[PDB]
Amino acid sequence: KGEWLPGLPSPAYLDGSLPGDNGFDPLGLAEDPENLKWYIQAELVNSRWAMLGVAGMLLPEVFTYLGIINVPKWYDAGKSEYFASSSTLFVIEFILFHYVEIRRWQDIKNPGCVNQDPIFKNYSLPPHECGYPGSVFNPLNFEPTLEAKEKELANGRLAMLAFLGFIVQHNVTGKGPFDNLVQHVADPWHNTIINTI
Amino acid sequence: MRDLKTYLSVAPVLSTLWFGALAGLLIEINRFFPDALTFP
Amino acid sequence: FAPDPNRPLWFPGSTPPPWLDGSLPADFGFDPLGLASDPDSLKWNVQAEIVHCRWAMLGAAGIFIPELLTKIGILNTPSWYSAGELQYFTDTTTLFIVELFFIGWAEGRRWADILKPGCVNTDPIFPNNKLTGTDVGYPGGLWFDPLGWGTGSPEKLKELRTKEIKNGRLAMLAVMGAWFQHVYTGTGPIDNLSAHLADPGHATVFAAF
Amino acid sequence: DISGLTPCKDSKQFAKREKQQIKKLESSLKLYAPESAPALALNAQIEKTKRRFDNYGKYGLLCGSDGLPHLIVNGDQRHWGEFITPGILFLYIAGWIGWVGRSYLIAISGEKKPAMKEIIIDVPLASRIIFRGFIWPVAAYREFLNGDLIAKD
Ligand code: CLA
Ligand code: CLA
Ligand SMILES: CC(/C=C/C=C(C)/C=C/[C@@]12O[C@]1(C)C[C@@H](O)CC2(C)C)=C\C=C\C=C(C)\C=C\C=C(C)\C=C\[C@@]12O[C@]1(C)C[C@@H](O)CC2(C)C
Ligand SMILES: CC(/C=C/C=C(C)/C=C/[C@@]12O[C@]1(C)C[C@@H](O)CC2(C)C)=C\C=C\C=C(C)\C=C\C=C(C)\C=C\[C@@]12O[C@]1(C)C[C@@H](O)CC2(C)C
Ligand SMILES: CCCCCCCS[C@@H]1O[C@H](CO)[C@@H](O)[C@H](O)[C@H]1O
């Protein structure tokens, strides 16, 4: 348990037991325990999705700048031609996620409902903690220590901020993240947010 | 000092300060962004 | 820092206000408007006066030392009044933003000190580096008191702080004096001093009509 | 276009209105020296009118048979900037105000004489509350599920 603002006392409901607790809740969103239980799951899933999203926007552009591969920009990959057309892909995504997210939601409502699979009733998910299924979802059997959860949450928060930065930078410059970085590092003192306004 | 701060927290004084700040903000927005019929 | 009821007053023959006691350095019983009636208000105002005094001392040095050396020829610095509108290695806006970041970190830690005395005396990165100060406004330590003059007897400390406060008050008056002199005379402060010394009977404020 | 209206970049009545406004402004210009301050002020008004009409042309507004812009509200995706986006921004500001008011009324309810904090406002408490409206949709939703929004009497 650290302090996000040295001097400010931590809120009472933030006990220092949860991973990633730095006493950061100035707007009192998590005062109700029922809201905090929901916000923990929301933070975990949003961080996990933002991690993959940021990797997907950044790394293929870095590898395109180096010449190893040639793929379109993240904001331009949408209107490319694939084997299945955008609408079919969206429908498939909607169906698959409508299944998996309701399966996940049943676990948030009550911890141990959907551990057993319907088709092969032999198998089942061992008892676990909410947001940390493990077993099949952790094939390499990495131990879920407090350090690992803290690292996951920190990297996820950094990833969400990176995603917001990507979106705002593309909206205000019209170019990709890595070329913005290259333009800034080329001449730092004349390529800033000020010179784009 | 304490009593004067208490008086400046009374409803009419706070109201005139708040609405003056709001009016100034709106006036400056209209001075720099005049004749707005839509939101581009 | 004990009460001093027989100290010289700003207005000889008057009675100092009860909240102005004499324990604070550079106390002359001057508070006609009762701006420091509350103890919290006095605590805040002491810190405000200290930071104003130090900033104005630095400002007075930066205006008056370089402009005296220009009139002698040891330096060729431009006028202080228009030094802000010159062109530098970067535009003024990014300089202001970088200054905002750095000074904001410093000022936020000072704010944390004001709100809660202990709070920020320890290095965030290297736990072993600590500030050795004790009173609010005097951080001490190797960074803000390398020579160790900041701590000592409870009698020489009071006069050492009184000198600082009075010098800061003088510099606070002097900075505004230079500003208004530049506004109303159109030339530098050392030019004003030399012109007044040449003709003290006429070269004054009234020499504008 | 929609409802028989024509875009204001095409309609001749819009241009005729713009020409007549400038002509009306230029008649008072004749009564002043070409270098005087009133002549400089009417010229600024002329430029303001030119900019206004050019903007109304560029934004893609529809004008009737009178040369005046007409608003489209039904929900057309090319006219969201006239009602939908401003309406969303208004609904965000008003909900902010309402939520900050509700939180302040709740915060002072449990006191000895809570009517004194309604005529003499506790400014620090208001400063604490005020910036909670930035996330007012999330909290307003969340007290709907739990049941802390509506008093069940
Ligand atoms: C900080 C001390 C200080 C000092 C030493 C001076 C000195 C001087 N000022 Mg000046 N001035 C000051 C503050 C000061 N000023 C302040 C705060 C203002 C803003 C109101 C001005 C506004 C000002 C104008 C507009 C003009 C001068 C001018 C002058 C010069 C002619 C004398 C005169 O007419 O004084 C006039 C003094 C005032 C109008 C107000 C001064 C009141 C201060 C605060 C009291 C200073 C005495 C005090 C006991 C401290 C003594 C310090 C000690 C070293 C003696 C002279 C070099 C004139 C000039 O340039 O000459 C050609 C001129 O035109 N001053
Ligand atoms: C906390 C502030 C607050 C809130 C949340 C509401 C909420 C509501 N009012 Mg209401 N009202 C308020 C203040 C408030 N009112 C005040 C001050 C008055 C006296 C002028 C009224 C007079 C009033 C009438 C006459 C009616 C409502 C109605 C309603 C309901 C429908 C919405 C509506 O018509 O709004 C319209 C709201 C107004 C016309 C008044 C708004 C006044 C300002 C904007 C509120 C300022 C609050 C405060 C000064 C700020 C707090 C600062 C604090 C942080 C220190 C809704 C439950 C209607 C209803 O019952 O139908 C369901 C209805 O008919 N209200
Ligand atoms: C999930 C996410 C992004 C996911 C991105 C994805 C999937 C991207 C996918 C793509 O790129 C690829 C892969 C390939 C491209 O070709 C296509 C697209 C589709 C473009 C972002 C979350 C982003 C989430 C963000 C940014 C959340 C920020 C929240 C903050 C800062 C809240 C802070 C507070 O709530 C606290 C913490 C405490 C309160 O007391 C105070 C406040 C301040 C209110
Ligand atoms: C005068 C002043 C305050 C005066 C206040 C007074 C008298 C108040 C008196 C009272 O309250 C009391 C005592 C008691 C009450 O009961 C009665 C009243 C009467 C109400 C502050 C000035 C304070 C002035 C300050 C802090 C000035 C700092 C200046 C700086 C840093 C300048 C820097 C530069 O000049 C350089 C260095 C180089 C240039 O090129 C660039 C720049 C940046 C321009
Ligand atoms: C800008 C936020 C802080 C503003 C503080 C202004 C004075 S705060 C003021 O203090 C009084 C006691 O002195 C109280 O009686 C009153 O309720 C309170 O509003």
UniProtKB/Swiss-Prot annotation, chain B:
Bilayer topology term: Single-pass membrane protein
Keyword Thylakoid found: yes
UniProt xrefs under Pfam families: PSI_PsaJ
Transmembrane segments: 7-27
Matching SUPFAM superfamilies: Subunit IX of photosystem I reaction centre, PsaJ
Principal localisation: plastid
Record's subcellular location: Plastid, Chloroplast thylakoid membrane
Keywords carried by this UniProt record: Chloroplast, Membrane, Photosynthesis, Photosystem I, Plastid, Thylakoid, Transmembrane, Transmembrane helix
Any one Gene Ontology BP term: photosynthesis
Gene Ontology, cellular component aspect: chloroplast thylakoid membrane; photosystem I
Reported function: May help in the organization of the PsaE and PsaF subunits.
Family: Belongs to the PsaJ family.
Protein name in UniProt: Photosystem I reaction center subunit IX
Gene expressing this chain: psaJ
From Swiss-Prot, chain D:
Cellular localisation: Plastid, Chloroplast thylakoid membrane
Molecular functions per Gene Ontology: mRNA binding; protein domain specific binding
Membrane topology: Single-pass membrane protein
Keywords of this entry: Chloroplast, Membrane, Photosynthesis, Photosystem I, Plastid, Thylakoid, Transit peptide, Transmembrane, Transmembrane helix
Record protein name field: Photosystem I reaction center subunit III, chloroplastic
Protein role: Participates in efficiency of electron transfer from plastocyanin to P700 (or cytochrome c553 in algae and cyanobacteria). This plastocyanin-docking protein contributes to the specific association of plastocyanin to PSI.
Entry's family note: Belongs to the PsaF family.
Keyword field contains Transmembrane helix: yes
Transmembrane segments: 80-100
Note: Plants lacking PSAF have altered thylakoid structure and are not viable.
Cellular compartments per GO CC: chloroplast; chloroplast envelope; chloroplast thylakoid; chloroplast thylakoid membrane; nucleus; photosystem I reaction center; plastoglobule; thylakoid
Biological process (GO), any one: photosynthesis
